UniProtKB/Swiss-Prot annotation, chain C:
It comes from Homo sapiens. The lineage of its organism: Eukaryota, Metazoa, Chordata, Craniata, Vertebrata. This is MAP kinase-activated protein kinase 2. Residues 19-260 form the Protein kinase domain. Changing residue 269 to D/E: Mimicks phosphorylation state, leading to elevated basal kinase activity. ATP binds at residues 25-33, 48.
Length: 285, 284, 285, 283
């Protein structure tokens, strides 16, 4: 018998409890994230500021539901305050000061296929939880994957529920409608996996002609980066990047794929990612 | 960085915390106001009783937002209780025992143009705050303006949000930033009617009254208005425009020199004080 | 920087510039095609006559757009004239006197699997261009596939846009970039049907119980015709003729298939097509 | 009898006639503006690239109609081409290499009340023309005001019809909403900046949004201490929050401060310096 507590929205002023700096930690889909400090405990946290409405209410609601998952940024508290005579949802979440996923990769000198497998597995676990409780994330990108600390054993966490949406013998179609909201995360996972293995996206710019290469599904595994990467992985990427949403792999089939399943049985083959990523600081702005 | 705390609705029985008398302190647009006493502290407060529904929820919500302003009656606590098997919003507010604005004026024996300017400025300040946070009061009348105490330095405060309504890149016109109808300009009319009474003791509008209002027929008759400066008559004339869009905005009003420099307005005495008691009859 | 010129509709009478014979060169979905001669140059061209309306305007507009592709019949000029007191779009296009695709195949005495691969690749290229500019052809059939000349190095070209229709950050999924129904996947079926006929000489769907065999997906690879054809090709055909539109292969997947990719590494195995086609002149009317 | 010619859209490829560089000359509301050169004549022009649709068709249509006005950027040619298999309106317009209005002010070391009057008058003329042919611009801002050359006698010209809209006793002759009066506000904002170097509505934010709807601004010293009460009064009247209380373009062009530009005091303004001294919060 597992129940978890529901969300108690705090109504007192947030400045009673926290010292709010104006150092920006990230730009969210609807409002920025600031650095804040626990007045009593001195410890550091992140504050996301949203203007109260049905949209913001849903973000908080869905995020809170997912907050249980180890690979989703944890909500610490939610405040409802008045800010310049308008209502506000202020979300306090744990501080992910390990930085973005591709910043950590970008800082070495090498990255291996086995480590890419481990990273993909923990992203996968976040998506798997979300899908199992009928939530599509709809915005799984590089900027939304951050690490808890700089320490080498930090946990990778998924952030930002600004685009998240609820997805609702007896066959699965006969148990509630459900459109393509979910399969759209599976594409993201494909795009991230591709970047993790070579350092660049599968879809380029040069650029209104990028938009067509995406709908056509024109990409490649060019050498030298991909010459080492096993056909088994390319085949997995090929399957997450199908242009037809229903041809795409589901999160359960993904988590059961042998490359993800047995992360520790994946060859230690080194990838170019680490260098290709710093060597290309320009067109990453 | 100013945040103010939001509204925490108490759910325990109000009678745990307050002794509720049944002395009526006023009749609100939707429910009366009773005198109550803090059980622990002995101190006196006012309780407004509302039946829970979307209407009452908005009154509380809007009033709480405005409660910060120094010239708006301060909400102390909001209770949600069961009263005769129905849900209830009970609002506890500070006690305004100085009485109504025109009751204080009515009790002397003289009132001056400069004081009228100081009164008008503090009503203005309440309206100014409301408008700035996108709330129209829609019911600014003599009965809604009360004083905190009888002491001569008491603050004047506005009450009753029963009619209040909400009114909704960097060089953009005000019309292109959200629709907004005439909700606000309607307070500006009240302000003109109050100002008129403040300076002479009777209203500017006396079934043929209904048409004099829509026509805009009123005057500044003597002897009351013969001392009053043309500058003030001109300001009243402009708040009482029958066409809502021709009417002055609350910012233009707070910037008008008569309101701006209250202390440079002539000390000229008005008839208000006497005309008001001399006319106790047709004020019921 | 590639721009190509847009469409200038000529308004002068077409008979100023061309001699119009009444030899019919084909029947289009909305108006027949006549043989005409350039008055000044003596050279031969084809004229398609359409009655001006939103439908005909779209054909011209879409055909002009695709006219740049090497494997699509080239539009020479478009006239807007009065014919019997009604407005008219007259389209002048290059003369494809090499005749229909299956007429050329039918005239030998043998056809090989490698040539079928080369034909399919060039039809594919036309579809690929169209899809990449968001146009579905919707009428890819034997009669719409003609050769430029009789000379053995002639180019195969696609005609008739009477059914053609338009089909409408940087990690964003293909579904989230505009709706789009099954218009395109319907060309992919035609490609399968054409490929099947090219390898054996008859259609996969035969002689009101035909209508049900198509929706059921009942067809075979009967002997003796199909006994030489590699399992690789049968598998590609099986995948284009999927009854469920979304299970069907996309044009990019198709142009990447090794059988199409390396036309010149396909076995030179002879097919029955050439003979089966003339031997069955009857039920082809 | 004055007829002017209508718009002939050229259908041939633009690269036949022009050499198209990719030096960006400005960012428009729907597509950027590039520097191009007349292949035959060597002369320089600006190209705006739009994707064909009803929106872009209207921009070109409305712009063409206003192109006659001396104070509106002149369209040279309009091409309809295929770019990556999609149709395209390409607009060639005269090259305004004198740069933006506030860049030219920002480059001296002084600006006078009389010159501000002359600038406001020529912006007003553009709006006046547009309104008289029933078009509201709806996007009169600092970036849309450019000069033809650097030469000191250059003409100031208005650009960008991406937001322009057609606007159809005076009330009995066709409906018409507040489209027009919204240009009149821009005119006030621009006049304010021209006289002191900063906007009337600040950031430092979500509280700027409310100061605009409330109409809270001032004429603070030292900048405004020389500026005549007559001008402050005109600005006050363009910046009325109520659109119908706002002055019309005809009333504006008739105001004595605009009418007799050359009888306006030569009083120097702070604008020139306040503008460079505040390069930061202007990005
Ligand atoms: O919801 C979101 N969307 C936009 C991106 C984002 N970051 C966060 C976030 C959450 C918790 N911590 C951080 C954070 C903390 N400290 C950092 C230090 C250095 C780099 C990045 C950091 C991010 C960011 C939340 C969101
Ligand atoms: O919202 C309202 N509706 C209608 C009028 C009103 N009066 C009040 C009010 C609020 C607080 N205190 C008082 C009050 C208290 N004590 C008094 C003593 C003597 C005369 C008047 C008094 C009013 C009235 C609230 C409202
Ligand atoms: O759009 C169309 N509608 C359906 C059939 C068609 N044929 C053509 C066409 C176009 C250009 N040339 C020809 C042509 C010319 N000469 C031929 C000689 C012998 C056989 C077929 C021929 C076709 C046909 C166009 C269309
Ligand atoms: O439609 C528009 N909207 C966005 C801004 C813009 N600039 C232009 C424009 C038009 C003509 N010339 C230029 C131009 C020419 N030369 C320049 C030199 C230096 C700086 C800016 C320049 C702009 C810009 C049009 C538009």
């Amino acid at each position: 018998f597992h129940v978890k507590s529901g969300l108690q929205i705090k109504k007192n002023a947030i400045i009673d409890d926290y010292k709010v700096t104006s150092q920006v930690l990230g730009l969210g889909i609807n409002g920025k994230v600031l650095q804040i400090f626990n007045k009593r405990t001195q410890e550091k946290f992140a504050l996301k500021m949203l203007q109260d409405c049905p949209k913001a209410r849903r973000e908080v609601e869905l995020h809170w539901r997912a907050s249980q998952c180890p690979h989703i940024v944890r909500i610490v508290d939610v405040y409802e305050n008045l800010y310049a005579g308008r209502k506000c949802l202020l979300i306090v979440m744990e501080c992910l000061d390990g930085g973005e996923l591709f910043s950590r990769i970008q800082d070495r000198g090498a990255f291996t296929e086995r480590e890419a497998s481990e990273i993909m597995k923990s992203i996968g676990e976040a998506i798997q939880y979300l899908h199992s409780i009928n939530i599509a994330h709809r915005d799984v990108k590089p900027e939304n994957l951050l690490y808890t600390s700089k320490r080498p054993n930090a946990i990778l966490k998924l952030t930002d529920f600004g685009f998240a949406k609820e997805t609702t013998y007896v066959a699965p179609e006969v148990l509630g409608p459900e459109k393509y909201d979910k399969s759209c995360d599976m594409w993201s996972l494909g795009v991230i996996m591709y970047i993790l293995l070579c350092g660049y996206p599968p879809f380029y710019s040069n650029s209104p002609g990028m938009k067509t290469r995406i709908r056509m599904g024109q990409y490649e595994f060019p050498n030298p980066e991909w010459s080492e990467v096993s056909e088994e992985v390319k085949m997995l990427i090929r399957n997450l990047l199908k242009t037809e949403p229903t041809q795409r792999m589901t999160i359960t089939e993904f988590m059961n794929h042998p490359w993800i399943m047995q992360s520790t049985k994946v060859p230690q083959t080194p990838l170019h990612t680490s260098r290709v990523l710093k060597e290309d600081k320009e067109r990453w702005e």
